[PDB]
């Protein structure tokens, strides 16, 4: 049968889910060797998909053009704060106790907020207002209502730097840098019952998943590699960012295994955090954007998703379509308002797929027997099983003799065919209308003056 996506549920990917979804582990910061073959364990590994036509994917066994691509995982030496959740993390850091892990609210207040959450319904604005109110109420409490442990204010430095305002034995106020490991350890202590108070799903948006311990490297198909006209492969910006991330992670792992001092470890941790932050979003405020060797800044996943040229607008809301033409228009008062002047060259190129029935069998047979170079003719023939055959001179008569009920014939544009006629910009719904095809031997479009 067939199924459709009834609904979409969003959440934060757990490290276990990233490990399970990964078909390979990436440790080599390289794409291709001298001869051009992929390197095992690299980003261009066949386990993550294949772009080059010759290669065959290891995970699914499919060739290029049909392999959907498979994700990989990178085991980071140290946890890295996700920048997109980073500010939200700070909010949780201002809402939960540093020792017990529970929210900084009384039991009666917690229960009342639960009734408030249940009562209001599903309007987003009320939920955000309640979350902001709860965070504001909890952030001003310096004593945990459940454990009584003292709390300290936390200062958030953009993009992923956390400062805790601590007091020494002499009363001096100093700032302690909260490492991502400490932040993740603090986030792990929050129970599932306090997560709805923080606006987090207990089974889908655990706060500890907001700190990245495993980095999901994208499939090969989503970041394809092409060969230039000079014979040199042109890598993607995401591929370069992942190469840098893998190199820094390997250096950090080597230094950790070598017993490097704390100055080494925190410096490499900061470098890895910067690399991951740029990989998530290269236009993050407060950091220098990642640049190529030519000085060109890279666009990472965030710039791929957002913007006019992004996936949402340039590829999802609006995209290029097939079976479309575009040319100059010239006046034609001799045709009706229902008719559009279609050139013969355009008509013989754009094809209407018409199924062979009991009443149009002779017309479609004549269209097939005319061929693609004779008007009115046909360009392609699709059998009922589903194989598309292009009509050439050799098989023009053979396919026509083989035509039967249920076949589809991509015939040329004929008179009376309905086509869309749109002019850009489309300010109103009247900027496109369905006209009738009128075939004339000239080159330009023809549209009636009214």
């Amino acid at each position: 049968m067939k199924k459709v996506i009834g609904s979409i549920e969003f959440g934060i990917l757990s490290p276990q889910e990233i490990r399970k979804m990964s078909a390979a582990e990436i440790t080599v910061p390289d794409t291709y060797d001298d001869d051009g073959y992929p390197i095992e364990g690299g980003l261009m590994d066949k386990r993550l998909g294949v772009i080059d036509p010759g290669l065959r994917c290891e995970t699914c066994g499919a060739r290029a053009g049909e392999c959907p691509g498979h994700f990989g995982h990178i085991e980071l030496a140290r946890p890295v704060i996700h920048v997109g959740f980073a500010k939200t993390i700070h909010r949780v850091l201002e809402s939960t106790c540093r020792e017990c892990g529970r929210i900084k609210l009384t039991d009666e207040e917690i229960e009342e907020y639960m009734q408030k959450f249940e009562v209001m319904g599903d309007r987003k604005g009320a939920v955000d207002k309640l979350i902001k109110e709860i965070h504001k109420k909890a952030k001003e409490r310096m004593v945990c209502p459940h454990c009584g442990a003292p709390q300290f204010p936390i200062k958030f430095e953009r993009p992923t730097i956390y400062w805790e305002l601590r007091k020494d034995e002499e009363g001096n106020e100093y700032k302690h840098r909260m490492m991502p490991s400490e932040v993740r350890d603090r986030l792990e202590k929050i129970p599932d019952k306090d997560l709805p108070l923080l606006g987090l799903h207990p089974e889908k948006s655990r706060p500890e998943w907001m700190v990245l311990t495993v980095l999901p490297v994208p499939p090969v198909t989503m970041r394809p590699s092409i060969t230039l006209e000079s014979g040199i492969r042109a890598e993607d910006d995401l591929t370069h960012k992942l190469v840098d991330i893998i190199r820094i992670n390997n250096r950090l792992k080597s230094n950790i295994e070598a017993g490097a001092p704390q100055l080494i470890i925190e410096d490499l941790w900061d470098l890895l955090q910067y690399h991951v932050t740029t990989y998530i979003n290269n236009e993050t405020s407060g950091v220098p954007p990642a640049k190529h060797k030519s000085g060109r800044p890279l666009k990472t996943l965030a710039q791929r998703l957002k913007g006019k040229e992004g996936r949402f607008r340039g590829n999802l809301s609006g995209k290029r379509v097939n079976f479309s033409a575009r040319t100059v228009i010239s006046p034609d008062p001799m045709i009706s308002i229902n008719e559009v002047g279609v050139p013969l060259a355009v008509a013989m190129e754009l094809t209407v797929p018409e199924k062979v029935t009991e009443f149009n069998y002779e017309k479609l047979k004549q269209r097939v027997l005319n061929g693609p170079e004779k008007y009115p003719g046909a360009n392609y023939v699709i059998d009922p099983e589903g194989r598309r055959i292009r009509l050439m001179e050799s098989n023009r008569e053979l396919i026509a003799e083989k035509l039967d009920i249920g076949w589809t014939v991509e015939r040329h544009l004929e008179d009376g065919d309905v086509v869309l006629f749109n002019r850009q910009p489309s300010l109103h719904r009247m900027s496109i209308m369905a006209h009738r095809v009128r075939v004339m031997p000239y080159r330009t479009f023809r549209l009636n003056l009214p």
Binding site: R251, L263, I264, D267
Partner: protein
């Protein structure tokens, strides 16, 4: 004498250390000591009275990026200048990854380890038949401790 860190290009820390040594010898620098362990990649340690001498000594070398502001305590680098074989701390039954050798980029399991011959015996986990091979103790890295 305070310990400071100098970041250098990976794979040529010894060359930068030798260049700094030559500069100190031929330029009368107040440098006390320079250390460049092979295990640590891309960084070197400099024992100097102050960080200003460190940044002055490393100045003029394009392969020396910067000097870290902090000061390394001597207990952190005490274990670096200690006579200890690389095979120490490796017990059979765990999993290791071979850094170099003919089996480059391969995971294996330790079967026999001895410190007298500075070598270790590992069985490849990807091999269907168990065939032990010998590899230098410094060519492996512990990935998970198990018996």
């Amino acid at each position: 004498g305070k310990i400071f860190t100098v970041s250098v290009t990976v794979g040529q820390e010894t060359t930068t250390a030798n260049l700094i040594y030559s500069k100190a010898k031929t330029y009368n620098l107040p440098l006390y000591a320079i250390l460049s362990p092979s295990k640590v990649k891309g960084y070197i340690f400099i024992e100097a009275p102050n960080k200003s001498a460190v940044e002055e000594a490393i100045r003029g070398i394009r392969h020396a990026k910067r000097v870290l502001p902090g000061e390394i305590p001597f207990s952190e680098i005490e274990h670096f200048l200690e006579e200890k074989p690389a095979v120490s701390g490796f017990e059979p039954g765990d999993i290791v990854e071979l850094i170099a050798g003919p089996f480059k980029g391969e995971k294996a399991k330790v079967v026999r380890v001895d410190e007298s011959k500075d070598e270790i015996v590992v069985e490849l986990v990807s091999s269907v038949v168990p065939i032990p091979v010998t590899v230098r103790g410094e060519y492996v890295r512990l990935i998970s401790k198990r018996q």
